[PDB]
Design a binder for this molecule. Sequence first.
Ligand SMILES: CC(C)CCC[C@@H](C)[C@H]1CC[C@H]2[C@@H]3CC=C4C[C@@H](OC(=O)CCC(=O)O)CC[C@]4(C)[C@H]3CC[C@]12C
Ligand SMILES: CC(C)CCC[C@H](C)[C@H]1CC[C@H]2[C@@H]3CC=C4C[C@@H](OC(=O)CCC(=O)O)CC[C@]4(C)[C@H]3CC[C@]12C
Lengths: 788, 788
Amino acid sequence: PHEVFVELNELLLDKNQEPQWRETARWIKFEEDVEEETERWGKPHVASLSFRSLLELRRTLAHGAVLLDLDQQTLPGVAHQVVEQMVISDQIKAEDRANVLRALLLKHSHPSDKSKHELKLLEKIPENAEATVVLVGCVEFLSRPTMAFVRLREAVELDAVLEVPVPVRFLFLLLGPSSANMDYHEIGRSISTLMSDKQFHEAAYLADEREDLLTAINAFLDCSVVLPPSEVQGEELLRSVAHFQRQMLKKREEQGRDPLRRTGRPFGGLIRDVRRRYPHYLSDFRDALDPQCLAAVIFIYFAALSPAITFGGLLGEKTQDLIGVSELIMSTALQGVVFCLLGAQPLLVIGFSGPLLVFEEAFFSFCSSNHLEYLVGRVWIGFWLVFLALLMVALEGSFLVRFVSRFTQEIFAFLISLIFIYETFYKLVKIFQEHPLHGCPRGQPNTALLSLVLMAGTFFIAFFLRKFKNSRFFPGRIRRVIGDFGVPIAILIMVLVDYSIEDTYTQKLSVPSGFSVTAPEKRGWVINPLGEKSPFPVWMMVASLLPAILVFILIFMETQITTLIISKKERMLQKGSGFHLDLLLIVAMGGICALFGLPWLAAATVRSVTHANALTVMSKAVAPGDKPKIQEVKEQRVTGLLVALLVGLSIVIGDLLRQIPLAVLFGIFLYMGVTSLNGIQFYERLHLLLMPPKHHPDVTYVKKVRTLRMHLFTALQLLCLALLWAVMSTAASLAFPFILILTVPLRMVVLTRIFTDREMKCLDANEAEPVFDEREGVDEYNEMPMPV
Amino acid sequence: PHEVFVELNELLLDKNQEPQWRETARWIKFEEDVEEETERWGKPHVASLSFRSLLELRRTLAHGAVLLDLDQQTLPGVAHQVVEQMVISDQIKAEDRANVLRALLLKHSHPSDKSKHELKLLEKIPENAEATVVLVGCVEFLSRPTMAFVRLREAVELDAVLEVPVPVRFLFLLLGPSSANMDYHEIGRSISTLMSDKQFHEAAYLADEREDLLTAINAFLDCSVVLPPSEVQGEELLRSVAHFQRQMLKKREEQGRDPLRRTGRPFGGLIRDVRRRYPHYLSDFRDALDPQCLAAVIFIYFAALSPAITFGGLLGEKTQDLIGVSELIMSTALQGVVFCLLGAQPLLVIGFSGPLLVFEEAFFSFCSSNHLEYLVGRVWIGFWLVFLALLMVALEGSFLVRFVSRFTQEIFAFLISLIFIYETFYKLVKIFQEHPLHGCPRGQPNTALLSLVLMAGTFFIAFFLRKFKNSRFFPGRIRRVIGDFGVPIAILIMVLVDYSIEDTYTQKLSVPSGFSVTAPEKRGWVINPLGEKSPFPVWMMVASLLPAILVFILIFMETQITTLIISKKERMLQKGSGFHLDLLLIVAMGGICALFGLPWLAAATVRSVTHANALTVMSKAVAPGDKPKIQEVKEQRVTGLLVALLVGLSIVIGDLLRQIPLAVLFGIFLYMGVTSLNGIQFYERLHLLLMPPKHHPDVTYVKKVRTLRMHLFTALQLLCLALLWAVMSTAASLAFPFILILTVPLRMVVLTRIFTDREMKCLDANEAEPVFDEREGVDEYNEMPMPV
Ligand SMILES: CC(C)CCC[C@@H](C)[C@H]1CC[C@H]2[C@@H]3CC=C4C[C@@H](OC(=O)CCC(=O)O)CC[C@]4(C)[C@H]3CC[C@]12C
Ligand SMILES: CC(C)CCC[C@H](C)[C@H]1CC[C@H]2[C@@H]3CC=C4C[C@@H](OC(=O)CCC(=O)O)CC[C@]4(C)[C@H]3CC[C@]12C
């Protein structure tokens, strides 16, 4: 029951008319061929063998000779008995035992002639494999085609017939005249393909007579897919063959033969998730003495720093510099270090996200209308956030995440992706109104156009760099560690270009001097929970619970959707998850930090996935032509600590971060908003609405359902999204999480009556397939339908 | 020997337990299947049938019933004789003769209900094509599978068994118990696949016994491709299956068994070419009473007007407005009408090209350093151009274009594409030089940035519109009628945007009032050949012959390559073309027209291709899943006349063409320069220089030759091109056609010394395949490896 490595040699004349047995083909899992003109290995492909060759092979084995359990060690030894019983049993007479043996004892030459190629090829083969050599050639001095099949009792390594030092178990030799109308190369290919299949060598092991070999051939024949003699003209061999083979194999085989579990005990989830990860604590600070962690932490720093200033500049601009970029950087370091040192899932990198920014900008306007302080409302919301977190954990309410399906996960992403574009365009339109474009700090000549030029330049540089990265010019291993390295290059290029111009004016960032708040005139370091400049109304210390529920829903969804995808069965995450502990450590820490005037934090979905797949290592011992598979993921909690410490220390360069114009940030904002739309199964279903049915794709949600019903589903999704967007534009904009949570009952009740269970299974398919920066045009953005 | 259309019915129970023989599959050339859940036709695919079904079919054909040469015209009668010979031939014993007859005379239900679907289907089916039906079913009261095969003596329609009104010749029916472990649907598919092959029905027509049918099956089996029972990954089939199929077919087939010619008569080319096109003169003006021509005229007018102003603007700008856009517009119409009235190939759209502009630019600087006059030099060059034209045709030599291969046909295009980009970037640098970007005609504030914005916007709009046009959102018939329709929209958008902003200054086109020269202060309407202001030197009377030779080489190459490519064999261009009446007409007209201070004209190869493939109509009677083929090309000489007349009359819109900013023209210039690089074989070979060999494509010039050899070929091309670029930048810039005519012998001599005859058949591949706006990302720019 071993693995078989097959090699097909041939007897072809050299440049100096030397017989010189030469290697022709090599089978491990799929066939590889050698071209005569370029003498290099080709790409692997499925071995498509003819039928007359199979018929000829079955016919000629009737008169062949078999040597089962042969006790020799060397090729000269085995050849003597082979030719002896060859002559004994009819084929080739006694007047030929001088030249047939001459052909067997010859020199074998390979094209790639402790080395490099040999070591690589041996690595490709499984560790414990047996080898087989098939020798076919045309000989002029024979009469009829003769065959000999042998099986050595003990696996013995030969001298030079093979390509790598692997012992042989079978040897198949075929010699015959060229007068007979037979293709010997095709017969050799057919017998190699037969020997390279499981059910044939598994019977050759147990074979003891020609009858067993004939039965094995017959049983192999009645499992194949015969193609007609019709010329193929393109993609015809993609609809039938694969699905037909899979269906036939399934039919032949069929007829042939929980962390999210309620326990009824208060605070049981915390105990269950702390009794697993913490025992393996010393294994988290010692399994990171490898170069891959050092390589990763360099590029994770940029990926964690770029959103820190992009989301901080807008927050500082909108809130009149009440919460600027300094607080966002300082808040990430304090919570990140605590989460890395004390958390259960250290692969999560926490940071400010999109929906939190939208909620903050919606809440800021609500306080301004009612003439209330903004910092104290946040701290009073923060206190109620801890109570809900403790209540939810004690009752083990984290199992509700199973009820959030793909129907809700994409409307949210589409909304958050439209918000960014609207914000960017509105900001541009406003800049074009502050400074009119008339002739010869308002009323400046070249501020209206310079901002547009910078925004377009940074957006297009980032877009084209992203397009270039996902191409054939980058190897898979270098494409996986590099976590979207286009933004740090576009920002640097635009800053360098803007630095050269020293005559015009443009708005810059608001980084302060030293360790101090961005606006050391309106607030201090601690926020008084009773009132800073005027008493806080007593009636909103109990009425602030309502926004607390909405922000808790947002944080809970954003944190629990990410953790499910990170910890799957396809990814080799072995130690343990943190479903219950992570929520507590993320909601309590943010509620505490809300006192010192710092924003809340979330799971940082895309950054989390990039960090998750930047530490993985892929298997190297895989057969060529097969899809790559994951081997193991390095689990440690020292790279997150280093990233958090570097982000925190990145505040000491405030003399450099002050030179960044406030237009490159909006260009990056628009770029992220545009690129977040990839991977959601709503955008392409909307694209399909503008195509003829003949051009529709071959995805799983078009073949199994009718077109009109799919269009109806898309129309319902559009109606829900439009209703929610219309609600958001009003003065009750502080309610959209409630509408987002009022769409799960709409799917469990209303949407179940219209559609059949089959269409719900086909369309609402929350299954997902992991990506590892393979193929073309697929990156970490395609993994999750959740926005950035 | 006719075509056969077969359909596979299958007895499947209805909703209310009704037998209702139902249609399951339909073969014309490739199989089409009906989906069970959505009951709609799927995409065509190759019929990949199993092997056990074939074996069972061969086994059960041994004791079947063959009603050869039946003489009935109704289904009840043929069913009566079928059941009669079944009960006679020991298939149904004694008690089942009416229940079986009950199943045969039932109602057939097709999944498609003077109509629409069958009118559409009748076109795809060949004209004199016979039809046949195969009926299979899993019934209980048989106790043993029974078969009947018939051949009606005369083709007779059989009411509603078929979905289209086409007579039937055969009908194959199979009934058997479900307790037999036979997949009846698979057997029906297999028998349909055999019946759809030429060598099987061509032997069933003249068969006389079941032995002939068995022999036909056996001969069909020994032509197929057997696939092993191994899972496919999607790409493993493309490498093997098609090539193996082709080689096996070639082996089986083997086992089974000038307009360019000098005569010796002076002016013989004109005599030979007049007697072919002029007899078919009245048909030219009568084969144009079709609705295609209106859309052709309008879209070709839009596609031919844009190059007139784009090339006219730069020529007017950088020649001190000696010749501008008005002269270019008047020159195109004056010669276009003459060529469309007296020409031999009226599909050529003559107009100003790139290389002519480059040569004019180089020549203008040469006359500004020797203190000569630019206009009179041109007219003295023009006189020598006619003499060379008359000498080159009387001594017939319009055959050296066969010696201009693809080696020297791509350096030219890449050179032009680099020249365009360099020109645009130099213009941008200069326009920034005149207007500095400091704070608060020269020195204007907003001219430096507005020009950049206008240049970038139009280029990006055109690029993205071209990318969108070649997607799957557009059908194959609307994509051919419209040419490059992104420029006429980008120009309009960027003119409308600039029109609103009226607070600043920017350079605009210089269009004069009425029919007058663009500079009515330094030149008139007729150029004096002896001198306008100062006497012209006499030593330039004969020293002007060399530039005449150079421009003659340029014009000859540009016209002859286009003439060769258009008049191919794949394109069904009837009547005849002319290689001798075109060159003489074009060169003589240009030489005479240079007297009045107007530029020369060329073939305008991309416009010629767009004109050629906009009048073509593709056949509709083609089997689904096959490559489209050309029915005919409408040949007429009234659309070119209309286009030329419209272009000429477009001069009265001088009050609107004066509002176009000059930066949009440079944006379009850069767009054309960038987009002209598609299709040249040198560019992808340059791309391959920076890619690992494992990711190399499967094109014909990588498999058959080694990597280092193609790298050396590309290095030699780069060396020659760099030498030509270096010599083009000196004070002798008007000598690069000499460099090209020198590098032509270089290919032959050196590359046959070095690279051997085998590789100089795939590296220097002049084959080229026609494009008809099919596939994805392929347009008229890929057809022609020449500049715009
Ligand atoms: C790209 C976006 C921003 C454009 C605006 C939204 C559309 C995609 C909306 C516009 C009107 C909608 C349509 C209105 C009516 C219908 C009926 C729906 O089917 C039925 O109502 C009954 C048919 C059945 O049940 O099978 C088919 C979808 C469709 C075309 C809807 C699909 C979604 C549409 C096209
Ligand atoms: C726009 C850029 C890409 C221009 C420059 C392209 C590459 C930098 C060029 C520079 C010089 C070139 C090289 C010049 C000489 C050779 C010989 C070629 O070798 C042979 O094939 C000789 C041996 C043989 O007989 O096969 C090896 C490629 C190489 C290094 C060439 C590969 C391409 C190179 C490195």
